[PDB]
Amino acid sequence: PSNQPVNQPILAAAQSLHREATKWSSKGNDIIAAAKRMALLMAEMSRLVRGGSGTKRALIQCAKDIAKASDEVTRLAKEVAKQCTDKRIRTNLLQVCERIPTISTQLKILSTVKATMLGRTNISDEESEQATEMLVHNAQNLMQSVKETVREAEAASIKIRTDAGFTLRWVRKTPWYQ
């Protein structure tokens, strides 16, 4: 009913991950399921960074939730790389996904920094604005790495060993015909 003020750059990054992940079915694909939760959590973050009642504790927990979903995307992508017979894709997948835990650790730290500022009133506008910018840059990097992982995991699905262990299902949620 009351449209909440948001940080547009963190929302646009969240929506972009959401668009990418909703191209696919979550049935038989826990990366897609996790990527979809990350986007909705990142959309919550765009509201939280603008301050308000209980946003300090909420912002800290939201970054922890995003980090847990990130951990899952990375675990799964490494399981896919282990079954992949194409050196180039396997290497891209492992490279593109090993950066995700690093970005999420920085997001937890940057969330705590901003949360501590929301809880105070002696912080300058320049300091408060740059604390948000750091979250913006981190959120954009995180949503980009997850889009890349989703693309490399999907590219690997046709380069999997005979009678493999773990595989992900890649079935479109968009119209089938052109």
């Binding site: 079915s25 038989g28 046709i158 060993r161 009678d163 595989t167 479109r172 949620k173 089938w176």
Partner: protein
Amino acid sequence: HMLDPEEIRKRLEHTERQFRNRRKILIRGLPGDVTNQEVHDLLSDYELKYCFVDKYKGTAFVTLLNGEQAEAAINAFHQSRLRERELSVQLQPTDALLCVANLPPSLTQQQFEELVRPFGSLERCFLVYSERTGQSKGYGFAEYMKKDSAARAKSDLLGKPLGPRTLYVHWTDAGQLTPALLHSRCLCVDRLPPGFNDVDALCRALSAVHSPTFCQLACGQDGQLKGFAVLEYETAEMAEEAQQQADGLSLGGSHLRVSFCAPGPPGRSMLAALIAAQATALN
């Protein structure tokens, strides 16, 4: 770009060797007191990879080395007598065969093996090519050792994007296939103009070589378009000839994409199944 006769022969022979690799036989009518040894003794001229004798039913499930051994065992022992029992020796009626359709026509036999191999051990794996040009018809068959593998493959491939295509998967009865029946009589037409509502102009355009026996636009229960059309021709040669001249043809400011459907069903069954598959996946 036309293929040299050596490449055409190479492809067709590989598809023929693959199609003929049915090495699992089923023996019925065995005596009540039959032993595993009696079955091993009966089939002593062949190399047995697997042999399960069901004493309670008078049946044996035997996996031989190749398709040549299976046909030789069938000819030698079908309707023969074993201690006055008439035996039935036939190819095992397995249910692990899939047709994977709407493949990119540029997809190679090797790439098709790469697509269908992760779901299990493959017994048969082949693309279906034109006998005239050696070019791929955009569909192939995958038969696994186990039905669970084929189910896993159908689940992951049905509605899977591959290039500018969405794959279709259809369970096929191995018993209903012959080298001739590998060639589809149905075509799938998509890339229709936006808000296309002139089915008659489509059937006419697709009547330039041969007239279709079936030609309908795909539509939901509310009558709204599903994005494509299914056509059927009297013969496989007629469908192939119509597909060759119609693919890429301009209609209503759009260049139509004309592909082959999975070879089994008639137009009415194919259209309903393709609508059902897309609707299930979208919802």
